[PDB]
Amino acid sequence: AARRRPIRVLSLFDGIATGYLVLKELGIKVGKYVASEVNIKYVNDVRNITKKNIEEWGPFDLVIGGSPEGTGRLFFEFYHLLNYSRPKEGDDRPFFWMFENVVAMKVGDKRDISRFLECNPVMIARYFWGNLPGWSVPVIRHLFAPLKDYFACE
Amino acid sequence: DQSREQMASDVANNKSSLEDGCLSCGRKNPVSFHPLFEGGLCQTCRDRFLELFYMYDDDGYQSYCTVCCEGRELLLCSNTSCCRCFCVECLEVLVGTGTAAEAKLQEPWSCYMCLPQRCHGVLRRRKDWNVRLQAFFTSDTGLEYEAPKLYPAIPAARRRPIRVLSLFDGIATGYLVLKELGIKVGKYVASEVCEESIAVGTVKHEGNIKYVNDVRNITKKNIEEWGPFDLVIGGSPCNDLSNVNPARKGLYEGTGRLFFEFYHLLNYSRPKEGDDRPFFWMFENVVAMKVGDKRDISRFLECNPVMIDAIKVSAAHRARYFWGNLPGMNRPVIASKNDKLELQDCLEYNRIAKLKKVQTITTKSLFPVVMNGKEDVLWCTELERIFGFPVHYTDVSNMGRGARQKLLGRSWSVPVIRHLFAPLKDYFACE
Amino acid sequence: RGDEDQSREQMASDVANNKSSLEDGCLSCGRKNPVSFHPLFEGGLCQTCRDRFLELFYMYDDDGYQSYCTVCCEGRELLLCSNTSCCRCFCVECLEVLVGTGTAAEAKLQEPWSCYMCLPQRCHGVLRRRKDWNVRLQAFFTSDTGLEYEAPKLYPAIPAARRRPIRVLSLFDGIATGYLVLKELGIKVGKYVASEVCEESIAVGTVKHEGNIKYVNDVRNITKKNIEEWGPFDLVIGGSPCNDLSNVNPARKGLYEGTGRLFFEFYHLLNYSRPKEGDDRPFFWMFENVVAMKVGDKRDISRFLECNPVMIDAIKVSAAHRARYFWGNLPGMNRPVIASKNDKLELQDCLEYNRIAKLKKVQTITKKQGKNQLFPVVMNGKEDVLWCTELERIFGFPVHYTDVSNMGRGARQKLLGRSWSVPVIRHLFAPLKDYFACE
Amino acid sequence: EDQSREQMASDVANNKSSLEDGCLSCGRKNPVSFHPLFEGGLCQTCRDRFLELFYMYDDDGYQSYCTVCCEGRELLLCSNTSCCRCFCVECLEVLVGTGTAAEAKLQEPWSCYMCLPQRCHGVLRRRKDWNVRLQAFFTSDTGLEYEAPKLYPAIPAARRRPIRVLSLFDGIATGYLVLKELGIKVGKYVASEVCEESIAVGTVKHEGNIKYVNDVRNITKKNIEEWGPFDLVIGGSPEGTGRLFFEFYHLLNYSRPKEGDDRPFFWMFENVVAMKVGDKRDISRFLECNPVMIDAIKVSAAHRARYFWGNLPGMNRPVIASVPVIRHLFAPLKDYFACE
Numbered sequence A: 001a002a003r004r005r006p007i008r009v010l011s012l013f014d015g016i017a018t019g020y021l022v023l024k025e026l027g028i029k030v031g032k033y034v035a036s037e038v039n040i041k042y043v044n045d046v047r048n049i050t051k052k053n054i055e056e057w058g059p060f061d062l063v064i065g066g067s068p069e070g071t072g073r074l075f076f077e078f079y080h081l082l083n084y085s086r087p088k089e090g091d092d093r094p095f096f097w098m099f100e101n102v103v104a105m106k107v108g109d110k111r112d113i114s115r116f117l118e119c120n121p122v123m124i125a126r127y128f129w130g131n132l133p134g135w136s137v138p139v140i141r142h143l144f145a146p147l148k149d150y151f152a153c154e
Numbered sequence B: 001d002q003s004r005e006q007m008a009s010d011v012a013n014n015k016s017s018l019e020d021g022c023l024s025c026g027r028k029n030p031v032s033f034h035p036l037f038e039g040g041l042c043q044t045c046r047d048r049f050l051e052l053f054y055m056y057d058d059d060g061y062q063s064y065c066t067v068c069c070e071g072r073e074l075l076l077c078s079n080t081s082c083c084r085c086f087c088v089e090c091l092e093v094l095v096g097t098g099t100a101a102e103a104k105l106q107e108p109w110s111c112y113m114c115l116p117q118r119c120h121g122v123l124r125r126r127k128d129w130n131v132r133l134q135a136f137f138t139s140d141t142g143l144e145y146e147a148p149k150l151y152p153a154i155p156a157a158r159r160r161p162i163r164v165l166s167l168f169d170g171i172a173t174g175y176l177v178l179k180e181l182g183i184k185v186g187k188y189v190a191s192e193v194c195e196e197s198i199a200v201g202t203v204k205h206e207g208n209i210k211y212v213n214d215v216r217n218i219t220k221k222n223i224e225e226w227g228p229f230d231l232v233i234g235g236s237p238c239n240d241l242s243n244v245n246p247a248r249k250g251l252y253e254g255t256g257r258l259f260f261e262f263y264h265l266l267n268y269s270r271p272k273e274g275d276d277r278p279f280f281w282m283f284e285n286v287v288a289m290k291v292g293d294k295r296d297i298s299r300f301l302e303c304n305p306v307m308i309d310a311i312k313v314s315a316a317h318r319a320r321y322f323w324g325n326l327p328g329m330n331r332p333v334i335a336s337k338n339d340k341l342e343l344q345d346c347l348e349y350n351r352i353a354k355l356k357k358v359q360t361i362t363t364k365s366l367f368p369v370v371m372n373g374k375e376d377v378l379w380c381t382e383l384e385r386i387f388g389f390p391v392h393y394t395d396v397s398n399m400g401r402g403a404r405q406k407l408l409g410r411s412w413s414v415p416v417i418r419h420l421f422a423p424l425k426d427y428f429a430c431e
Numbered sequence C: 001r002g003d004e005d006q007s008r009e010q011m012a013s014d015v016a017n018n019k020s021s022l023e024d025g026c027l028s029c030g031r032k033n034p035v036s037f038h039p040l041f042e043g044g045l046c047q048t049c050r051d052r053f054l055e056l057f058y059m060y061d062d063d064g065y066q067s068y069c070t071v072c073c074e075g076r077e078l079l080l081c082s083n084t085s086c087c088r089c090f091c092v093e094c095l096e097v098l099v100g101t102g103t104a105a106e107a108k109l110q111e112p113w114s115c116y117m118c119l120p121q122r123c124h125g126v127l128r129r130r131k132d133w134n135v136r137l138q139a140f141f142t143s144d145t146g147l148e149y150e151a152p153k154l155y156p157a158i159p160a161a162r163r164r165p166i167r168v169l170s171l172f173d174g175i176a177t178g179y180l181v182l183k184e185l186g187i188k189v190g191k192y193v194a195s196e197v198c199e200e201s202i203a204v205g206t207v208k209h210e211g212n213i214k215y216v217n218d219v220r221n222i223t224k225k226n227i228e229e230w231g232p233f234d235l236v237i238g239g240s241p242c243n244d245l246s247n248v249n250p251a252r253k254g255l256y257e258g259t260g261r262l263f264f265e266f267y268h269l270l271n272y273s274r275p276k277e278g279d280d281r282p283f284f285w286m287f288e289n290v291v292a293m294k295v296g297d298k299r300d301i302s303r304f305l306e307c308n309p310v311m312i313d314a315i316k317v318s319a320a321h322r323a324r325y326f327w328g329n330l331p332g333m334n335r336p337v338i339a340s341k342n343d344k345l346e347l348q349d350c351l352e353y354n355r356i357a358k359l360k361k362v363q364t365i366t367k368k369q370g371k372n373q374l375f376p377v378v379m380n381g382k383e384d385v386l387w388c389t390e391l392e393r394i395f396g397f398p399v400h401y402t403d404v405s406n407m408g409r410g411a412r413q414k415l416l417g418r419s420w421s422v423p424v425i426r427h428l429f430a431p432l433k434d435y436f437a438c439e
Numbered sequence D: 001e002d003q004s005r006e007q008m009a010s011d012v013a014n015n016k017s018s019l020e021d022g023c024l025s026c027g028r029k030n031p032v033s034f035h036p037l038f039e040g041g042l043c044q045t046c047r048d049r050f051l052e053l054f055y056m057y058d059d060d061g062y063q064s065y066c067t068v069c070c071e072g073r074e075l076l077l078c079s080n081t082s083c084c085r086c087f088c089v090e091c092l093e094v095l096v097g098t099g100t101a102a103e104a105k106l107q108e109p110w111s112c113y114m115c116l117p118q119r120c121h122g123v124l125r126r127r128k129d130w131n132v133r134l135q136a137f138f139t140s141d142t143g144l145e146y147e148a149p150k151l152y153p154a155i156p157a158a159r160r161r162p163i164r165v166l167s168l169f170d171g172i173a174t175g176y177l178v179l180k181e182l183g184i185k186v187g188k189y190v191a192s193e194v195c196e197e198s199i200a201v202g203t204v205k206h207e208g209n210i211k212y213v214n215d216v217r218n219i220t221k222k223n224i225e226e227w228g229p230f231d232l233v234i235g236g237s238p239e240g241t242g243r244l245f246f247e248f249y250h251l252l253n254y255s256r257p258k259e260g261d262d263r264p265f266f267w268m269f270e271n272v273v274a275m276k277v278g279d280k281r282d283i284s285r286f287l288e289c290n291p292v293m294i295d296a297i298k299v300s301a302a303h304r305a306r307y308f309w310g311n312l313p314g315m316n317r318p319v320i321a322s323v324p325v326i327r328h329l330f331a332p333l334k335d336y337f338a339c340e
């Protein structure tokens, strides 16, 4: 129940590639960095990810994405990727995720994405989602500080 | 950008063939073919030809050019039981110059398939257009997904009643089809939100449908309270993602986002790992929708859509994409001994049908019936016979022409659905 | 203020103190010289009041309530029977004068009210109720009016060996109720000429009956050669429009003018199409109109046709209020009406699934236009109105009868409102089976 | 498209349009018939009003409306005696030229265009033979083709029996005086009228077997079968118009001879011209006959324009100028009935 393996991650919109730097700043190393957009690794696009790709490259631990045209386009592709990368039913492996969205978005979208993710919205003049206890880098640093719960810790 | 003139001149000299000739485009290197005449089509023209073929204007004719699918005005064929219109400049460049005006000065005009013909110019028809056009839409290539795994057969004395779920229930076509096949329904949970539609399911089916609520309110916990399910039907609203309205919002905006309410709620009801009970599903939407989204519905469901046109079993023009994993969903369509193929079979007394096949029917309303020497139109009790519905089915809750026709304009076709659910009589209860 | 024209309180005190009776004075103005009886209570009426109890008795508002007092038929003031199963209303001028002063004072504030036809019978001074008011009401409208005419001739019975199909001429056909009823009985209709001018009734009668009935143009364009060619007819049926004959219309024209002239077309064609002198074939005919009409028009019609009407209410056989007059010479036309085992006698027997009726019988055959017009039925715990499929059941028509020519609620309801009633017509036509060929 | 009256007047002045291409009264195109006084078409919306609004005369003896438009905004009387023509302001000033109406309204005494002989003053000219056009416009101009009534045989001097009349809708004595001027034997006379008193032969010194009766609402078939048989039935206008016609029709139907009867039976019915077209066609259809006009201003002062629906012999024969018209109509009866 201690000294876990280095974490491996899958993400959408790696972008600035600051996730690896943030992870290394906390004093831990990432076991495998996986990304797909068109040791930050870029291979293909989100639109050409299949089930077998997740079978060969998974399983993962958490996902960093969000919505920094339409919100539905990226949101539902994110939902599909997360549903493909979900851990099998009736198991115990730790698993996290994350979704970002701007404040300016209609109430109907709030309703749909609260129904879909099955988690109630949480405000931060800022928005955050997910089941994780806890741009502008201080909020990501605050979220990644308790990362030791499911990381390498003796 | 080589204009079609010099290649049209060259191909007449038999220096090559039209396998490299894009009829609507001219530019060489085609990635596909053309299923009406001999020739090929490039990717850019193929994308437009996939979409723009299957609509029909209020005049009862093909909206755009058959070959080029472009132009503001062109000739209109005037032959009965035909509606295809040809382009003007598509003729004097390819088939021959001077025939655009000589045919215009004389009436009636006949398109090149109405009259038997030979290879005029370089426009030679495909000898098998009837089956070449059919394979263009169903035998496509998006990702060549794997075939579904057939469940092992279930013998007698181990057949349990089916627990049907239904989203966007409409006028309850699924229940009607399931009770005509002979299958024993043990439950049916519908999620219609229209007051006029609920009064049709309640009165006609004697309150055997558990009308629950809006689709968007059914949360996770409710499924196991009502479930477990065995058949998850669903058809999203088709008024947004279509090449008929100027708005034409995508699948991810507007009311087009009502598809995910089907996939997400299909995920919940499928059996967990270690469970080996039969489980089925199905989805349905319009074909006249952008090719940039046709490969999305197929990706999420991880299946390939079939095409079934109602003209093979009915007296109306309607064809749409069917997803799902029903057993034997790819078999050829065969009509029956109790179908209504032509208009004269679906008319009241003292009326004579001019045409033989109604064109596409929608919410909005040439006239097709003449009685007592006076031109007439179709009644509300005649649109029910076309689709296979029992007569007087919609005579409920004080509705007239403007309401008994809007509901039938967006429904399913009974004998089309009866073709998909037929192999469902082997895994569930019967009699 | 005179002796012959005494006030109401004078006769009330005279009968209260036993110096006089009630059957010698009029109950609406206090006059002497009674000419008739009062059908409900005890007393008499004067010729001015008997000739208004025959017009305004069967008139109801749009919300199902009588517009006039039940005693005097004069609405000086109106307070209603708040209890259900009653449309009655008693006027204030009749309460304190006969019952007692200040009675309307407590009758207005106490809630709810219950009319004098609802209470168990007593004698509230001089306002008392007869034991058999229904039987006297039935004879009020069909006795002691106008003159007396000779009884129509009765034809000898025809054996079943020699019987022929019935030939029918139907002026103002409507939606062909006569053909429907005659086929329901089981009489072979060998010919049926119908004269209608409405383009939708033609559609109904053409579609539903598979073109077995022959149509004719306007009734004002039919000559005598036409009747000679199409005949010999055997049953001349007809009902004239009542647009300008009913006393509901403020701008009435009555007979002799306007739309009321169309009775004379029936009269003329019936004279043309009847057997000549020295002919012994069975000829039957029938005419019908509304009860709420002036006595002058009714007496003129009786004088022209040479017979007295009978009143048949379509409430002992169905679930509606429908009072009409019937002139004719059909056999057994004045025998009491008894409902059959396959009669939908209540409103709940003519409803869809999951709908519950709050009443038992509906008012005059409809959608003051509040809290009783939008509330004849309940469904899913809410107020709802009747459906066209349910009106077709109330009137006794086959279901979905008017589902042709893609017409909506308004047109179907309009066609159904002015139609006939199938049970009444079947009762009238039942004895015809003894003269013509059956099945 | 709709042309005004002044524009139409200007067009006719230039002779760019004929006189039979538009309505004379409303000034619009699409004629349906011709105008009797002048030459000119008539639209159906304007034509129908002319047969019912042309002979409206007041008790003073003037035309009710303008002789041209018949729309009574204003009236200009004619100073000539026995003249019944009236003029408005627009029908002349707008149509035949500006200032014509003002000029014609100042010269007192004033002579209307009908009084003076035929002249074409502007764009309106009187017809050459309008005297027959006036009659052709009204009688037999519209309707069916009902077969003419048959002509009864004559009984020469062989037992001419006295007449016996049922006068219904007239004066009580009117119709009896005329029957006596010609010297015809009256074997019975059963008079009647709309609501009145019932009495014996005694009301005045008249003793002619006059069984005077009250309201017709008291006569039944038994009375007609007992008081008859009859040989002549009268009626006509002396509220509305339906009462008279329909009571007369009922009594005629009751008194009509049965099938196979050869004895003569004559009847009549008269009414003023000022009645709507619907009443005219209803009377013609019910009585199965067409009306003939007998213009009577020259033969009887203050009486004219009476239609007649009868089977009297030689009704439409030409006349050679209360008493006069009825006497002329009833004169042929001397051949069938008793004399002196």
Ligand SMILES: Nc1ncnc2c1ncn2[C@@H]1O[C@H](CSCC[C@H](N)C(=O)O)[C@@H](O)[C@H]1O
Residues within 6 Å of the ligand: B168, B169, B170, B171, B172, B173, B174, B191, B192, B193, B194, B197, B213, B214, B215, B216, B235, B236, B237, B410, B411, B412
């Ligand atoms: N928000 C919502 N929740 C539940 N149903 C809805 C809905 N919005 C639209 N619908 C229903 O979805 C239907 C789509 S039309 C498809 C009807 C159905 N396929 C048939 O057999 O006819 C409409 O009839 C509408 O009543």
Ligand SMILES: Nc1ncnc2c1ncn2[C@@H]1O[C@H](CSCC[C@H](N)C(=O)O)[C@@H](O)[C@H]1O
Residues within 6 Å of the ligand: C171, C172, C173, C174, C175, C176, C177, C178, C195, C196, C197, C198, C201, C218, C219, C220, C238, C239, C240, C241, C418, C419, C420
């Ligand atoms: N001029 C005319 N000639 C013949 N029929 C006419 C007419 N004018 C009106 N009618 C018809 O006469 C009908 C009177 S309502 C009575 C119809 C009939 N009793 C029934 O069963 O309903 C109307 O429906 C109207 O269509």
Ligand SMILES: [Zn+2]
Residues within 6 Å of the ligand: B022, B024, B025, B026, B027, B041, B042, B043, B044, B045, B046
């Ligand atoms: Zn191309």
Ligand SMILES: [Zn+2]
Residues within 6 Å of the ligand: B065, B066, B067, B068, B069, B070, B071, B086, B087, B088, B089, B090
């Ligand atoms: Zn083209």
Ligand SMILES: [Zn+2]
Residues within 6 Å of the ligand: B077, B078, B079, B082, B083, B084, B110, B111, B112, B113, B114
């Ligand atoms: Zn063609």
Ligand SMILES: [Zn+2]
Residues within 6 Å of the ligand: C026, C027, C028, C029, C030, C031, C045, C046, C047, C048, C049
């Ligand atoms: Zn009185």
Ligand SMILES: [Zn+2]
Residues within 6 Å of the ligand: C069, C070, C071, C072, C073, C074, C090, C091, C092, C093, C094
């Ligand atoms: Zn009263």
Ligand SMILES: [Zn+2]
Residues within 6 Å of the ligand: C081, C083, C085, C086, C088, C114, C115, C116, C117, C118
């Ligand atoms: Zn009561």
Ligand SMILES: [Zn+2]
Residues within 6 Å of the ligand: D023, D024, D025, D026, D027, D028, D042, D043, D044, D045, D046, D047
């Ligand atoms: Zn005119």
Ligand SMILES: [Zn+2]
Residues within 6 Å of the ligand: D066, D067, D068, D069, D070, D071, D087, D088, D089, D090, D091
């Ligand atoms: Zn004038």
Ligand SMILES: [Zn+2]
Residues within 6 Å of the ligand: D078, D079, D080, D083, D084, D085, D111, D112, D113, D114, D115
């Ligand atoms: Zn003059």
